[PDB]
């Protein structure tokens, strides 16, 4: 390949894209253009190709590698969307390290997005707070700085995403008067607190060690603000007033190091309201909605406050351990169709990870590839061309990744029997009646078979599917095994409960144990260590509890024990096709109290 | 002589605890005294009501174990007296337990059992009220209240008519769901929450009792959830007693005659929501409150101070609003899985003095079971007998040797049971220090409670713990096997409370010897020792309780051992020059709280969950 007009760092750029992208012994006349976003045009090894943004060179690679794997050239994009960006969570345990941010940077540049995200509570490092991030893998400054300069060498975008009121619970929990001393109620600030306001100079001075000058502030919806230590110091007071008054304050921080600054449209007197729209752009965040129309709807609503605006899409990875690439996909193509129609300027494709961030943080590149051709061609010709050009893998293939999550009974949001399955007890399995081992058992087992085909497909993003292989195992067998245990019981068939006891649920703590094994690595590759811990936790105690299924059976087995309680208690329904949608850990493992105290 | 087929059929029954001699007694009621034994072997004996005739056998035995002529009259400062067993933080007490702990109360001299339930019991027509929970069915309760009734004991349930109720409000149901105000708080004014309050008292109305604690404590953000956003702001204290009236009237259908707990009045009409206040009642309240006074008796409940006054100060907040009080005092047993009864002696005895200084008619010792109901159900009998003593004697004078009649044990000895929390440099006065806890379950790789422990210290004492409970075991008869699990425990706590210190200390100095050794042979050792207390904890909880809530410390300490492996790979597999750095090891550990900030490092951390892990395993 011998490329004329290009400069070093775009040179430099290209050789670390060498590593995934396999590019032609071409010649090729690469020159900023207005023209389009994206231009190609040639034939005979000699191709001129064009960009409007720098960073739209390097998608501009991604697609003439594709089209000269076959053809000897004629495309040209219009970008829909001044700015398309990626936001990894980073504060629900997963805190995704240097090295993945940079995998991350690079494959995202290939797929065209102009801008990448960490959602961080607290879980960036800011100067005398040390109990802010404490044990949590906080990136420093550093760290922060040199994720930002890899970005900058795709003249890719850095934007952190904080929050300067509510969501951190892992910071206030910490009962030092530093800390118990800003604090409202729950997980929420006090407002007002002059200490409190300290610790947001606190943040920004630290983001002003970065280059951008952009942040989300977060400010998301918090229902009892005002309502807790708030109220004993003050009396009730107007919550609408009290947030702007904090807002007010917030922004003025910023000004100082002149962020300009983002926040969740959540919250949004009226004269306090209508002053502080001009200072920021809301974010509308949905990921749920299935028709245009209903979006069309709700932007309406959203330039009735303001039209300074930007949409958050979601790819889905915030329901335990599987994505849901397939529905991402299905609300993308809404979504767009409707961010199109109303003018929306900016795009933001959300990674949350509720709940202990147990998806892999590349589990939804299909769905990240999805909004770029989207945002670009406006339809999904080159999706899985030019999906194979970045990720070596069929975008069908790739999705493949979701099976745990695609039931045949059930298109729909959040139907998670990938982990509310995984993490049930034996003893006491109160989601049973959302299981139809009918179609469940089966369908779990084929999947395994499957993933395990397309580990074989998948480079070096196979340890994602390994680990999707061996849980789709354990759920072939674990979806039904304790209702078998309640029917054998029932019949008193201690040969088969024998057989289930000494037999059974020892191969399941191996595959679980196996499980284990493959997820850890998958977190170390992909994260930093801090917040396994608290995936050892859950398993080690899902493997005990399946010691006690072995153990109540024995001695039961044994006659030491005339019934055994557990079995005879009838379940219900766990909460109002059989499935649904459970994605708390704590209320899936046990009926028991784990958090009150 | 003078008996009865029920009298004598429970002495029958008695014959299990105390070993009865050959002579002969004539058993009579009067008012003269509350107990009156006299007699040179034929005895004449008394009680003013049927159940002290038990204590006065726990009497009669032991001072006729050294003589043979005895003269005795107590005469009992409470009107009753009361033990309140948690039986809804996770660990039900079965019905052979609780048979066995009537038994010993009517010895001791109790008039009352109670059973804290705030959704333990089965419910018609509220199938998730008490699922999977181990709720007591009706023929249960049945059993344990016609038990108690054998030895002429009141039983009184204790339950939740506003908050604590997490256990039931967890399920995301609709008929559920719609009766929530926030957190764990029902919702005041919507009418399916007084439905499913009819059906408490309804399914209360079985029993022969019709005393009731209906409870609502601690209900913190009380008309500030979802009855906000339909009523809007109204005065939380008003509301309060607006669903107190309602809840009476309810309870005045079926006949019951009710209990509560106080402290909402005072952090509602306090300034800096606190309990220990002097309160301002505003005047909608004062009017509301004169008419509710009449029909409920407020209880006072305090396990934390160590003087006379402090008590005192606070019932005389308490007469601004009533004078139909009852205390509550302690027997520590929420704190881990270690109980605290030589605080709970301390204690009692300031609370006695100001209690009688009060003239309080009856005293309930509770004995909680906070954050999963760890701690053993008989493992605080000495401050049941140490509240007995106080109540019919007012002093300790009996206590070594009543208690030895009752239990076969010296009081003395029984309380060492505590030692996994007495450290040596702890004055003996401050409540809730519980490295029992903190220590065992406490991470390896990343331990947040370190800056808490001065292992030369602690590992001698839990070192030392271990031997003398181990011996203790051996002579505790049918109660062996609350020592036999405090002694493992010492042991575990012995070298686990600086293992993790021990590590960090090495890796930084790189002592890959010691890296080395524990990895291979300490962690291993600890994690057999933990699998060993797990079954002897499951024992003494399955003798104790009903299986249900078990699953929760199975949960916990499976959590802790897979905790233990993860610092013997990543160790491991830095050793093995896989990893550059143990990142874990390279932080450096902050104070966890600065509560007790103070010359001793120890302090008090009872949620397990911040105990554990730095990260969420609770949020979203
Ligand atoms: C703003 C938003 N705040 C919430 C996030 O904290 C969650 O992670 C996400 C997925 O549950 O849903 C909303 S989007
Ligand atoms: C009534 C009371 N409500 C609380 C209980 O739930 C706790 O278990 C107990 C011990 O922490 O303290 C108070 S007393």
């Not at 400054?141 to 300069?149: G, M, P, V, W, Y």
């Not at 920004?204 to 919806?221: C, H, P, Q, W």
């Not at 129309?293 to 605006?309: A, G, P, Q, V």
């Not at 105690?541 to 024995?554: D, H, P, V």
Request: hydrophobic share 40%.
């Amino acid at each position: 390949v011998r490329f004329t007009g290009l400069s070093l760092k775009q040179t430099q750029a290209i050789e670390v894209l060498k590593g995934h992208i396999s590019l032609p012994d071409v010649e090729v006349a690469v020159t900023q253009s207005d023209q389009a976003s994206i231009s190609i045009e040639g034939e005979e090894g000699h191709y001129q190709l064009t960009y409007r943004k720098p960073h739209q060179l390097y998608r501009a690679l991604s697609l003439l590698v594709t089209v000269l794997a076959e053809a000897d050239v004629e495309i040209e994009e219009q970008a829909a969307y001044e700015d398309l960006a990626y936001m990894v969570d980073c504060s629900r345990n997963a805190v995704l390290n240097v090295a993945s941010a940079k995998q991350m940077i690079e494959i995202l540049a290939l797929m065209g997005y102009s801008t990448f995200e960490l959602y961080m509570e607290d879980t960036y490092q800011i100067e005398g707070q040390p109990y802010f991030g404490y044990f949590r893998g906080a990136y420093s400054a550093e760290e922060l700085q040199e994720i930002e300069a890899y970005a900058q060498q795709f003249d890719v975008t850095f934007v952190p995403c904080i929050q300067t009121l509510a969501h951190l619970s892992a910071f206030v929990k910490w009962g030092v008067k530093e800390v118990q001393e800003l604090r409202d109620v729950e997980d929420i600030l006090l407002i007002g607190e002059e200490k409190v306001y300290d610790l947001i100079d606190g943040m920004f001075a630290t983001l002003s060690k970065l280059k951008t000058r952009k942040v989300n502030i977060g400010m998301d919806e918090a229902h009892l603000v005002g309502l807790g230590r708030y109220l004993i110091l003050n009396g009730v007071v107007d919550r609408s007033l009290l947030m702007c008054q904090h807002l007010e304050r917030v922004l003025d921080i910023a000004d100082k190091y002149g962020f300009h600054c983002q926040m969740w449209s959540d919250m949004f007197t009226r004269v306090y309201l209508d002053r502080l729209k001009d200072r920021v752009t809301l974010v509308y965040w949905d990921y749920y909605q299935d028709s245009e129309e209903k979006y069309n709807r709700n932007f309406r609503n959203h330039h009735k406050i303001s039209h300074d605006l930007a949409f958050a899409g979601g790819a889905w990875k915030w329901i335990g351990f599987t994505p849901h690439n397939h529905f991402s996909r299905l609300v993308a193509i809404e979504a767009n169709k409707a961010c199109r129609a109303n003018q929306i300027k900016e795009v933001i494709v959300t990674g949350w990870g509720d709940n202990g961030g147990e998806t892999a943080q590349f589990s939804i590149l299909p769905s990240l590839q999805i909004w770029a051709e989207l945002s670009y061609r406006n339809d999904l010709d080159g999706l899985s061309a030019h999906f194979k050009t970045n990720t070596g893998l069929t975008v069908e293939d790739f999705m493949q990744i979701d099976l745990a999550n695609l039931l045949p009974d059930l298109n729909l949001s959040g139907i998670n029997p990938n982990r509310y399955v995984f993490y049930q007890d034996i003893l006491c399995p109160i989601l049973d009646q959302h299981m139809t081992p009918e179609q469940d058992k089966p369908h779990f087992a084929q999947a395994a078979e499957t993933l395990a085909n397309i580990k074989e497909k998948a480079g070096n993003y196979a340890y994602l599917f390994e680990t999707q292989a061996q849980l789709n195992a354990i759920l072939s067998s674990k979806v039904d095994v304790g209702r078998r245990i309640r029917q054998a019981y029932q019949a008193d068939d201690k040969e088969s409960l024998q057989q289930i006891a000494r037999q059974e649920l020892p191969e399941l703590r191996s595959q679980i144990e196996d499980f284990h094994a493959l997820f850890s690595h998958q977190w170390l590759k992909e994260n930093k260590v801090f917040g396994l811990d608290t995936v050892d936790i859950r398993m080690g105690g899902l493997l005990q509890r399946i010691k006690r299924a072995e153990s109540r059976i024995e001695v039961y087995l044994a006659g030491q024990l005339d019934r055994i309680d557990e079995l005879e208690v009838e379940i219900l329904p766990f909460t109002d096709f059989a499935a649904t949608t459970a994605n708390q850990w704590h209320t899936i493992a046990t009926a028991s109290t784990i958090y009150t105290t």
